[PDB]
Design an enzyme around this catalytic site. Sequence first.
Site, mmCIF file in Angstrom:
data_model
loop_
_atom_site.group_PDB
_atom_site.id
_atom_site.type_symbol
_atom_site.label_atom_id
_atom_site.label_comp_id
_atom_site.label_asym_id
_atom_site.label_seq_id
_atom_site.Cartn_x
_atom_site.Cartn_y
_atom_site.Cartn_z
ATOM 1 N N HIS B 52 -3.072 0.474 3.337
ATOM 2 C CA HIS B 52 -3.931 -0.039 2.315
ATOM 3 C C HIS B 52 -4.204 1.222 1.394
ATOM 4 O O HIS B 52 -4.327 2.354 1.885
ATOM 5 C CB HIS B 52 -5.385 -0.465 2.707
ATOM 6 C CG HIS B 52 -5.396 -1.582 3.716
ATOM 7 N ND1 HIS B 52 -5.171 -1.399 5.061
ATOM 8 C CD2 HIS B 52 -5.602 -2.920 3.505
ATOM 9 C CE1 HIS B 52 -5.240 -2.595 5.642
ATOM 10 N NE2 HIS B 52 -5.458 -3.523 4.754
ATOM 11 N N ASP B 55 -6.789 3.514 2.858
ATOM 12 C CA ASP B 55 -6.453 4.268 4.074
ATOM 13 C C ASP B 55 -5.909 5.660 3.687
ATOM 14 O O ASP B 55 -6.120 6.634 4.436
ATOM 15 C CB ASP B 55 -5.389 3.582 4.914
ATOM 16 C CG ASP B 55 -5.730 2.217 5.483
ATOM 17 O OD1 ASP B 55 -6.917 1.972 5.714
ATOM 18 O OD2 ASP B 55 -4.812 1.412 5.568
ATOM 19 N N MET B 86 6.205 -1.340 3.330
ATOM 20 C CA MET B 86 5.173 -2.292 2.817
ATOM 21 C C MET B 86 3.884 -1.505 2.574
ATOM 22 O O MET B 86 3.599 -0.499 3.251
ATOM 23 C CB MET B 86 4.932 -3.286 3.986
ATOM 24 C CG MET B 86 3.988 -4.416 3.699
ATOM 25 S SD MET B 86 2.235 -3.936 4.030
ATOM 26 C CE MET B 86 2.175 -4.298 5.795
ATOM 27 N N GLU B 179 -0.875 -13.332 3.368
ATOM 28 C CA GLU B 179 -1.131 -13.387 4.847
ATOM 29 C C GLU B 179 -2.332 -14.294 5.095
ATOM 30 O O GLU B 179 -3.428 -13.944 4.679
ATOM 31 C CB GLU B 179 -1.465 -11.950 5.292
ATOM 32 C CG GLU B 179 -1.866 -11.836 6.821
ATOM 33 C CD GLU B 179 -1.971 -10.452 7.313
ATOM 34 O OE1 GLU B 179 -1.641 -9.470 6.583
ATOM 35 O OE2 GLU B 179 -2.382 -10.164 8.471
ATOM 36 N N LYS B 181 -5.189 -16.385 7.371
ATOM 37 C CA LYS B 181 -6.108 -16.184 8.574
ATOM 38 C C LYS B 181 -7.152 -17.266 8.408
ATOM 39 O O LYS B 181 -7.640 -17.597 7.295
ATOM 40 C CB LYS B 181 -6.795 -14.785 8.458
ATOM 41 C CG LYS B 181 -7.572 -14.500 9.800
ATOM 42 C CD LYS B 181 -8.322 -13.153 9.645
ATOM 43 C CE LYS B 181 -8.858 -12.662 11.002
ATOM 44 N NZ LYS B 181 -9.557 -11.314 10.741
ATOM 45 N N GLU B 215 0.673 -13.623 11.009
ATOM 46 C CA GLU B 215 0.303 -12.652 12.107
ATOM 47 C C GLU B 215 0.041 -13.464 13.392
ATOM 48 O O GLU B 215 -0.608 -14.464 13.265
ATOM 49 C CB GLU B 215 -1.036 -11.960 11.781
ATOM 50 C CG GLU B 215 -1.485 -10.937 12.865
ATOM 51 C CD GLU B 215 -2.496 -9.929 12.437
ATOM 52 O OE1 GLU B 215 -2.104 -9.233 11.439
ATOM 53 O OE2 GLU B 215 -3.619 -9.820 12.894
ATOM 54 N N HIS B 218 -3.587 -14.562 14.245
ATOM 55 C CA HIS B 218 -4.187 -15.413 13.210
ATOM 56 C C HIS B 218 -3.900 -16.866 13.474
ATOM 57 O O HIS B 218 -4.842 -17.692 13.421
ATOM 58 C CB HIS B 218 -3.868 -15.025 11.745
ATOM 59 C CG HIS B 218 -4.395 -13.674 11.356
ATOM 60 N ND1 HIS B 218 -4.109 -13.093 10.099
ATOM 61 C CD2 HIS B 218 -4.992 -12.668 12.060
ATOM 62 C CE1 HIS B 218 -4.593 -11.860 10.114
ATOM 63 N NE2 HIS B 218 -5.199 -11.615 11.240
ATOM 64 N N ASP B 243 3.601 -9.754 11.137
ATOM 65 C CA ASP B 243 2.607 -8.903 11.840
ATOM 66 C C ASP B 243 2.557 -9.293 13.342
ATOM 67 O O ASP B 243 2.238 -10.451 13.580
ATOM 68 C CB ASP B 243 1.222 -9.013 11.195
ATOM 69 C CG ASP B 243 1.025 -8.171 9.939
ATOM 70 O OD1 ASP B 243 1.969 -7.483 9.486
ATOM 71 O OD2 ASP B 243 -0.013 -8.249 9.321
ATOM 72 N N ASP B 253 -11.031 -12.345 16.507
ATOM 73 C CA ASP B 253 -9.643 -11.703 16.432
ATOM 74 C C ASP B 253 -9.607 -10.425 17.227
ATOM 75 O O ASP B 253 -10.260 -9.462 16.839
ATOM 76 C CB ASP B 253 -9.300 -11.683 14.992
ATOM 77 C CG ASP B 253 -8.435 -10.630 14.429
ATOM 78 O OD1 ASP B 253 -7.445 -10.357 15.086
ATOM 79 O OD2 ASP B 253 -8.831 -10.091 13.359
ATOM 80 N N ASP B 255 -6.775 -8.500 18.299
ATOM 81 C CA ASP B 255 -5.758 -7.524 17.907
ATOM 82 C C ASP B 255 -5.222 -6.706 19.058
ATOM 83 O O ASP B 255 -5.102 -5.435 18.921
ATOM 84 C CB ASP B 255 -6.281 -6.639 16.724
ATOM 85 C CG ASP B 255 -6.409 -7.297 15.396
ATOM 86 O OD1 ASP B 255 -5.973 -8.448 15.149
ATOM 87 O OD2 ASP B 255 -7.105 -6.708 14.519
ATOM 88 N N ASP B 285 0.332 -4.892 13.764
ATOM 89 C CA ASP B 285 -1.045 -4.838 13.212
ATOM 90 C C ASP B 285 -1.988 -5.085 14.421
ATOM 91 O O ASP B 285 -2.236 -6.240 14.788
ATOM 92 C CB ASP B 285 -1.215 -5.894 12.125
ATOM 93 C CG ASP B 285 -2.569 -5.725 11.417
ATOM 94 O OD1 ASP B 285 -3.427 -4.885 11.793
ATOM 95 O OD2 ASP B 285 -2.703 -6.449 10.410
#
Lengths: 385, 385, 385, 385
Positions: B52, B55, B86, B179, B181, B215, B218, B243, B253, B255, B285
């Site tokens: 991102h 980040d 990406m 994406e 969710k 993902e 998700h 993802d 979520d 992860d 992810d």
Amino acid sequence: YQPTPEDRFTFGLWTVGWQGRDPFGDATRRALDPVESVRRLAELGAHGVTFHDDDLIPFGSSDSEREEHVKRFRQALDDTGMKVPMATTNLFTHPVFKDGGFTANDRDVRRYALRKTIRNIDLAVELGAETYVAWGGREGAESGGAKDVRDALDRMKEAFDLLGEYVTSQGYDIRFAIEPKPNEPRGDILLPTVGHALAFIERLERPELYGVNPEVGHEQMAGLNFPHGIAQALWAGKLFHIDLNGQNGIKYDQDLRFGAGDLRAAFWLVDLLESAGYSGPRHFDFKPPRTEDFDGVWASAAGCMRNYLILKERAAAFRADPEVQEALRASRLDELARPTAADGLQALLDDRSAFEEFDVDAAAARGMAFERLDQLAMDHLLGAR
Amino acid sequence: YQPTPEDRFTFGLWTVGWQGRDPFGDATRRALDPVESVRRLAELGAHGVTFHDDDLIPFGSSDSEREEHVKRFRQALDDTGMKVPMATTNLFTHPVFKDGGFTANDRDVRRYALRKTIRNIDLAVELGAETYVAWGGREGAESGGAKDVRDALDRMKEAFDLLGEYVTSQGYDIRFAIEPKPNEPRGDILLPTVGHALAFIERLERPELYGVNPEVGHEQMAGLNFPHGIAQALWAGKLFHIDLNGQNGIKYDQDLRFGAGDLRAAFWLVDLLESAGYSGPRHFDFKPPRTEDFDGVWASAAGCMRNYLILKERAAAFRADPEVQEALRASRLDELARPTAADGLQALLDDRSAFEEFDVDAAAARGMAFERLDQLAMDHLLGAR
Amino acid sequence: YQPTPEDRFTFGLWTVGWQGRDPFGDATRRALDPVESVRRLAELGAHGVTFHDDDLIPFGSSDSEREEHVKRFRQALDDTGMKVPMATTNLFTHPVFKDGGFTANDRDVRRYALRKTIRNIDLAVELGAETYVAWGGREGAESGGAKDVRDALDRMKEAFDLLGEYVTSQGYDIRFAIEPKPNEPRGDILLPTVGHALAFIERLERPELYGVNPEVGHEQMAGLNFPHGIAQALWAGKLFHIDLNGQNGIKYDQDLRFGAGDLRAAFWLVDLLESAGYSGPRHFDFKPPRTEDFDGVWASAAGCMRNYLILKERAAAFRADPEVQEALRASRLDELARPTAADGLQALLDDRSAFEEFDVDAAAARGMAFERLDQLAMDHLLGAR
Amino acid sequence: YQPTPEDRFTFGLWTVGWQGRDPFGDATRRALDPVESVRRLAELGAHGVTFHDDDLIPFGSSDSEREEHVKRFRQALDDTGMKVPMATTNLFTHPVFKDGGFTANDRDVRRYALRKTIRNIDLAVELGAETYVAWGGREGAESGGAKDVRDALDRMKEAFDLLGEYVTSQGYDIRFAIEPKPNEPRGDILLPTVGHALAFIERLERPELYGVNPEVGHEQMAGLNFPHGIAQALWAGKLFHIDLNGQNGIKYDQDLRFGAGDLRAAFWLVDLLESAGYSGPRHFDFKPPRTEDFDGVWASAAGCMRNYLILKERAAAFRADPEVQEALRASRLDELARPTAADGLQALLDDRSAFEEFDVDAAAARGMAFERLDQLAMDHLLGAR
Ligand SMILES: OC[C@@H](O)[C@H](O)[C@@H](O)CO
Ligand SMILES: OC[C@@H](O)[C@H](O)[C@@H](O)CO
Ligand SMILES: OC[C@@H](O)[C@H](O)[C@@H](O)CO
Ligand SMILES: OC[C@@H](O)[C@H](O)[C@@H](O)CO
Ligand SMILES: [Mg+2]
Ligand SMILES: [Mg+2]
Ligand SMILES: [Mg+2]
Ligand SMILES: [Mg+2]
Ligand SMILES: [Mg+2]
Ligand SMILES: [Mg+2]
Ligand SMILES: [Mg+2]
Ligand SMILES: [Mg+2]
């Protein structure tokens, strides 16, 4: 809160006609003759009825028996003034459909499924139906190796394309509505939600002929927001019909009367249909609980209509209240309806107030005033203004 | 089961870089410098990283600081040979995005969101990214009156159209991936699943520029079958990126590392990507749990890759086994791949073996042999053949 | 619908004091001084407040700072006449508690957790609290090997036994209430529901000292019926306190204001507390959404109370209506309250009307009249009688 | 991976005997004679069978017909050496039970339910059953007004107390096991989980006579962790029997073969039963999918046993590996098994290392090494060491 035929309320024969058999129990009620259902519904204020081929003509009926069944039904319609705005096919009860209709692995089955569907399209037109629903309840799997989903989608596309070729060639004034459901009776069903069905339609040969028939309980079995799913169907111009009932969260499909289950979601659905000017049937696909006798069936059916009329009143009062109109402005609903950049790409790129000079902290500090708006919504729903 | 850069495994900076802050807890780990993450990932056998804007370049950085951040990152890439396939934008952390980016009620915010996105598209191309992801985590609501979904979809369409106009005008070789969710952090998020995102793309001005980035976790937060959702994206020609992670059912979520959560669903996903010839990045992810120190972060990251390689091996052995090939024929997977009616509509209508003379009972009696096939699948997954 | 201190409405400092940090976002509001919250709550009509040790005294405070924090708080209580009926410990925010408090694998941590708890019990008594809540938010795991549940239950029992020994020895007039939650922040939390907590209490050395503190949203994250769970706690004589808020199904814990989420479940909860003569605090454990500014926080807090008062009115009207009393008799609620066999075992065994001569078909045919009763309930809730 | 009668695998008559009727479909298979099931199960390596009264003796059978049914069954047992370790009552299929058995509103029904139960207890003892299961599938409601839960719990207590008085008076060596389920077929079922059933037992007159019969799929329909629920039953000394099958999340009850559904949860369950020394029957309560013919039924039944044996092997290898034993020490599982304060309350209170001098930061920094341990668990499950 009395319904009249002008409110456009409809019911499937299979709803008030459900005998109460479940996965763990025998029937608790005797079968109802379709003629009796028509009459009782008319007396309650319904506008019309709907049917699967198998609800009207017992599976395996001779052509003679078929004609007899139709004539009796037609007489009831004439006697009461009830209409038939939608019909559909049963491609799920008989054992032959254990692996699906349009996407069964056996090719012979798939061919049979299309023939059974075409025969009913003919009847539907004869009876004046405007919409033909397709719910592929057996299309899916319980295990990963059993179905190649890419091949199954090819098969599903082929089936819908042939049905479109059929109506076109005959010159019929009927459109198709696909009804999604995430699971039950299969482990996972193909086209599980309103979004998956909308995306699939765009790949058919004549996309204009097909829309969706969403059902309250179905999207709630995936924990999705029904009013949001309906807004997306409206936005695409694809809400051809709708199924109304109640559901208490993520579990087996309960099919409660409309208004039961998620009451606030019912309120927001009514607000939307009414605001958007939805002019199709308000169809109830529900099951009076097996605890009830005949008196209970009619009471539950009456409650479906009553609940819609109360909600309609409350949503209308909500939107007409000056104090609500002021709160909507306070929460910037007006600003959401204005284009972000009607000025265009270049103007956006050159606008320093959009980035270089944008005061992010000042914007961040602005409260949305959503809780005051929601409390006015609750006050209205409860008649506590 | 050693990964090499040829396996195309990628990780976001935000994954191994998650400090462990949750809704109820402070951070348990110190922040990692992006340069360190690049080096550690290269040593584990990863192919590349993703980011991102926020980040890589701390929010509110001067142009000077920005350039410095980029140069250091670029040096790390050169030193290790890692790629950047990406990139994406952070339109969710800062308070200004509390009501969304592209669909915030305030028009000023929406304009800001587009400007912040365009700046990052430029960097992404500079770094060689082929795909630009968009996850609208703040687009949605907690209450019914706060967002008119029809207006919000208009706003979302406008935003994606302007981004398409932008890349086109600049002549960039980049495609977009949306994406979905269903919820978290908003009560309900717009475009909640793979189907809703696919349906939305078909309404954009230049649909060819956009696909999905599904993902694992998700779709499982809605209780949907991930491999089925991916098969529908493949069928539409829209799987631009993916993802991978783990999730234990319908809840917040989690992860988890890939392979944890639903192991059988992980097996079927691998079988599909590999069979279909998916040639994009295998991106993870995920978040190493807050219970872990640095050693634990690297172990979890290594486990993501290890799990994919073991599954790949097991799916390949499954498909190559003669006994499995025989079972697939027994279950009529071959027949699912043949057209239902290549003979056409008329031939179908005139074929008595499809209806008039079809032996429904004989067809119904045929077992599908799905449980034997599933048991061979289990034996293969477990290395118990 | 104006609340007064006699309605016994309470709020945690952490509720109106939530700054809006979530898994994906920074704070949207500044911190509130506990003194300000006390004053604002008093003006809205609240009866009292509650706190975690860490809400009142910043972690790591010197004894000097501690005393200062307490005195200021005590002054606010005196100025407003607000009470403190419950207090609790924070055993979840600090990183040391990453693997739990009472059931952390490290023995040193477990000892620390008990010491931090005992210090707060002392303060709670000083302030006049009658109930001490324990929510073990970090007791659980994300993976199967990390925690031996039998050993963890031994550890949890040991902890609660030592706390009981402590209050007994000091002669304090305080009782404990355990608060279950199924997940979040851990993958799975120990004692996940009202039933698991009730069963655990029966194994403690002095079971009389402990009850439950159920929370609306918590049982709904497992898809359970909250009013049914509360009826079982009432039946066991263990409802020592209750947490009220709203939740939209099985997903992350939303903590909406009371009345939002499942409105019909809120109606049935109110009916029950009021019918049963529950005389404890009506505590709100909720979070005003991060979209709101200060005005919004107070509006949401006010809505919690307003919603309870409207529901109270509607449930009372429901129970007092002659037509409802008649429907309850029609549905045999009277018969459910009579003993099945007060005559005893032998009399039952010798009664031919109970088996040999029982007319099962006649009994089966009797409708329960549940849908008419439910519709009267809906009419009452909506003010549509 | 061949089972022998020593592995203690059992099946209900109703499992391999399920004809495939679902909410939307007719039967796909013919009924199986109990004698045939006994023989086929013996050949597969099963240890024994279980039954509901109605599976063995058709409802409404004369005493003559009853005796005939029993004798034939007894002959099959003698011929094969199969045992009958558990039996239960059908209090859910017949319409008379539409509102429940023990908690029906009608008092006459409740009396009938007890008589039907006592008659079967007698047969069960005759056949050598050690455990009598009770699953109250119809005890619950679809609406809030229909059942006063406090009165229903009184009724449920009364029923279980009378059954305890009965076995005591007769001198039978049989114990009761209550089986919880959250929903389906009722909207909500009373005693919905393992915790609620454990808590209820503690209020019965002779608690020693009752335990639980948990079922994999049941706790997963509430999204709970099955192995954790079983550890709590073990801790209370109440795991009298267990039902094994598979389930894919929160939806309708699927009843897949054991091993299907959540594979990792199946691994952790096996590890626990085997570690704890559970010596009761390994019973499979599952339904071969309706897609299958007879060959498929036997294959699915065989897969249940095969899956347990593979998991047993993998869990044993996991626990015996030196490298795993080292990882468990690294993750402080040893420390979780040691008392927190065997030194006592006073010693804890005087220990400065527990609070005053405890280094919270040093403790917080210690990683738990849970991900390395979990990866060794995955490697073991997959046979990839
Ligand atoms: O889940 C059942 C579906 O709602 C059907 O009733 C369709 O609407 C008609 O086949
Ligand atoms: O739920 C979090 C989403 O997965 C994000 O990580 C996106 O992939 C990137 O913004
Ligand atoms: O899920 C959060 C819990 O509700 C806590 O607020 C407790 O009630 C207090 O520690
Ligand atoms: O959900 C169905 C239950 O599992 C029953 O099979 C019981 O175990 C026996 O009545
Ligand atoms: Mg349905
Ligand atoms: Mg429907
Ligand atoms: Mg996520
Ligand atoms: Mg992602
Ligand atoms: Mg909470
Ligand atoms: Mg709470
Ligand atoms: Mg079951
Ligand atoms: Mg069972």
